[PDB]
């Protein structure tokens, strides 16, 4: 629990991030709206990505080099990752027609916001580079960070494209829901920005810029990302919204979920037809019918066994590729992800 | 007409831009969608911003330094500006609830596209930095260009925020439609990316990176941007869609248009009430009523006089601040904008 006490210290730095980003009186009204956007969307999460930057920074840099300004740049780059997340989620909730996020109504669903949330999400993305310029402009890793935040956006956007193309509204897409398709979607849409980006940001900030070390870390982190998305898909249906903070839509949205991939792999010809007639539709009785089929195929028990096989697999990859990084960097993140 | 012959040469370079951006078989389907997005949204315009990069590059660099690779980087940076435009317009058409753009139906209005256009617009933005990396990575102006494309996005997004905040759907906002408000909106939402960004990109590519020269060029270019937006607002209502390629929505969208600012400045107490009761609403009879009031206040004649006063003003600013740049750089763009 290296991030447990570090959680409140990280959140305490948000007020300054806002003050700096909310510092030309003509654009006053727009700046007031940006503060309102930041406060609604970048707060309320677990901050696992933002904290990973800070915790990984501390574990990779010698304390004699961890000065007040150096640490300030670490929390700031941590909050840049949280703004990247906030950008993706504001937009993903519109495209996934979501209702709630982190225990409250979706920013676009708020009266008086609507489709203006599209520009609001883009302002969240713009703020990353605004922060990187304000704090990392003179640093030798400045361009490496910008290129890493830009590349992470492209990877995710390419992943979202795959996600939306495999899930067309109104079209039976069971033929597309394969294991190979699934692994490509989750690698691009989640695994790069959620696991590779926070550790790589800390690595570049610690002067670790070698291609081999970044490739070795990536081998561990992308496999961890694959599990986090399988867990996210499992919780979309079998998770408690009081804990998850959001309401699942994967069945209604005809999404290439891990569960439907597992359903199709185990379904009898009769069970496939029930799935065909009820998947990808808005009717509650159809969604209920799909959830009834999943429970009949013991997919929650199939997920339990997967979590164990996956945990053992990621641990074998940490033993294989962690060096010369402290294994604590990868274990702390494994601890946050597995329960 | 320094861009007239240069138009077809610029468009001929698009096929390679697509081939390079559409060059991991797993993401094949997403890459096919990106090509479809590029071909629908980055083609059909006048390409004035993209051509300005190329024409300004030619006029600022000595021909002995204008090699095949150097020129290739110029057309590519020109197409980066066209992709920035395509990103903003795909998103602006959703938020402005537009029907057509460049003679065809809006990408989001297309059956099977919808709100997925949000991710499509973000992929267009991602492509800029993908291109800048592929062609300008080794150049000394690489970071200056990235920072200029990022800063231009923020400026525009801050401008769009002002634009949407001044135009709330369902609220009478005539008190907000002032000359001071108007000049702030158009400076941020249009003037920076449409006029400063193409010339500044060429300036950095020509090794002109001095703050004073960039400030002097900005003085001319932002004032030119203010006129281009006044002309855009005028054409929203009094322009021919066969020429403009789009259908005006400013009255229905309760936008802080130059015309409504001019209406309010000249309206009798009785005329103000007709505007109050009919502006910002979707009913055709209400929009017709507003257009009838504008024509009664001779706003098309008021625009004619403004275009002349503005032309004389921008020409005085070129005489004042053009040096040491060739005046041809600013005159060619003035020629494209004024008619
Ligand atoms: C990409 C994933 C699977 C979904 C959201 O991530 P988080 O679970 O980290 O959400 P927040 O804590 O930031 O709200
Ligand atoms: C920002 C302005 C005022 C609107 C669109 O610009 P253009 O008139 O340049 O549009 P395209 O030629 O690119 O279609
Ligand atoms: N990966 C971003 C958002 C998600 O994880 P979320 O379940 O909406 O939070 P998705 O399932 O849409 O991929
Ligand atoms: N500036 C971007 C788009 C516009 O010019 P357009 O008239 O929609 O092309 P707006 O009037 O919305 O500002
Ligand atoms: Mg989602
Ligand atoms: Mg999604
Ligand atoms: Mg999910
Ligand atoms: Mg518009
Ligand atoms: Mg607009
Ligand atoms: Mg307009």
Curated annotation (Swiss-Prot), chains A, B:
Function recorded in the entry: Key enzyme in isoprenoid biosynthesis which catalyzes the formation of farnesyl diphosphate (FPP), a precursor for several classes of essential metabolites including sterols, dolichols, carotenoids, and ubiquinones. FPP also serves as substrate for protein farnesylation and geranylgeranylation. Catalyzes the sequential condensation of isopentenyl pyrophosphate with the allylic pyrophosphates, dimethylallyl pyrophosphate, and then with the resultant geranylpyrophosphate to the ultimate product farnesyl pyrophosphate.
Residues that coordinate or bind dimethylallyl diphosphate: 101, 189-190, 229, 246, 255
Pathology linked to this chain's protein: Porokeratosis 9, multiple types: A form of porokeratosis, a disorder of faulty keratinization characterized by one or more atrophic patches surrounded by a distinctive hyperkeratotic ridgelike border called the cornoid lamella. The keratotic lesions can progress to overt cutaneous neoplasms, typically squamous cell carcinomas. Multiple clinical variants of porokeratosis are recognized, including porokeratosis of Mibelli, linear porokeratosis, disseminated superficial actinic porokeratosis, palmoplantar porokeratosis, and punctate porokeratosis.
N6-acetyllysine modification, residue list: 46, 276
Catalytic reaction(s) noted: isopentenyl diphosphate + dimethylallyl diphosphate = (2E)-geranyl diphosphate + diphosphate; isopentenyl diphosphate + (2E)-geranyl diphosphate = (2E,6E)-farnesyl diphosphate + diphosphate
Cofactor requirement: Mg(2+)
Cellular compartments annotated: Cytoplasm
Modulation of this protein's activity: Inactivated by interferon-induced RSAD2. This inactivation may result of disruption of lipid rafts at the plasma membrane, and thus have an antiviral effect since many enveloped viruses need lipid rafts to bud efficiently out of the cell.
UniProt site (Important for determining product chain length): 87-88
Broad class of the protein's primary localization: cytoplasm
Gene that produces this protein: FDPS
UniProt-recorded name of the protein: Farnesyl pyrophosphate synthase
Swiss-Prot/TrEMBL keywords: Acetylation, Cholesterol biosynthesis, Cholesterol metabolism, Cytoplasm, Disease variant, Host-virus interaction, Hydroxylation, Isoprene biosynthesis, Lipid biosynthesis, Lipid metabolism, Magnesium, Metal-binding, Steroid biosynthesis, Steroid metabolism, Sterol biosynthesis, Sterol metabolism, Transferase
Biological or metabolic pathway of the protein: Isoprenoid biosynthesis; farnesyl diphosphate biosynthesis; farnesyl diphosphate from geranyl diphosphate and isopentenyl diphosphate: step 1/1; Isoprenoid biosynthesis; geranyl diphosphate biosynthesis; geranyl diphosphate from dimethylallyl diphosphate and isopentenyl diphosphate: step 1/1
UniProt similarity note: Belongs to the FPP/GGPP synthase family.
């Amino acid at each position: 629990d290296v991030y447990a006490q570090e959680k409140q210290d990280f959140v305490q730095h948000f007020s300054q991030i806002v003050r700096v980003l909310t510092e030309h009186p003509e654009i006053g009204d727009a700046i007031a709206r940006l503060k309102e956007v930041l406060e609604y969307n970048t707060i309320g999460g677990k901050y696992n990505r933002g904290l990973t930057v800070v915790v990984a920074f501390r574990e990779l840099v010698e304390p004699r080099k961890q000065d007040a300004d150096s640490l300030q740049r670490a929390w700031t780059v941590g909050w840049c990752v949280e703004l990247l997340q906030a950008f993706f989620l504001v937009a993903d909730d519109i495209m996934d027609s979501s209702l709630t996020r982190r225990g409250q109504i979706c920013w676009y669903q708020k009266p008086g916001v609507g489709l203006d949330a599209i520009n609001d999400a883009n302002l969240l993305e713009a703020c990353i580079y605004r922060l990187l310029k304000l704090y990392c402009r003179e640093q030798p890793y400045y361009l490496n960070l910008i290129e890493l935040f830009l590349q992470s956006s492209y990877q995710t956007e390419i992943g979202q494209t795959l996600d939306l193309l495999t899930a067309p509204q109104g079209n039976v897409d069971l033929v597309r829901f394969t294991e190979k398709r699934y692994k490509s979607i989750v690698k691009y849409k989640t695994a790069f920005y959620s696991f590779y980006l926070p550790i790589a940001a800390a690595m570049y900030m610690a002067g670790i810029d070698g291609e081999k070390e970044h490739a070795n870390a990536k081998k561990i982190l992308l496999e961890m990302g694959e599990f986090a998305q399988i867990q996210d898909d499992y919780l979309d249906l079998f998770g408690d919204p009081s804990v998850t903070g959001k309401i699942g839509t994967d069945i209604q949205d005809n999404k290439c979920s891990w569960l439907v991939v597992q359903c199709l792999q185990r379904a009898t010809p009769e069970q496939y037809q029930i799935l065909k007639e009820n998947y990808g539709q808005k009717e509650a009785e159809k969604v209920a019918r799909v959830k009834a089929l999943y429970e009949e195929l013991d997919l929650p028990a199939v997920f339990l066994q997967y979590e164990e096989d996956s945990y053992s697999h990621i641990m074998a990859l940490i033993e294989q590729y962690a060096a010369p990084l402290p294994p604590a960097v990868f274990l702390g993140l494994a601890r946050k992800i597995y329960k």
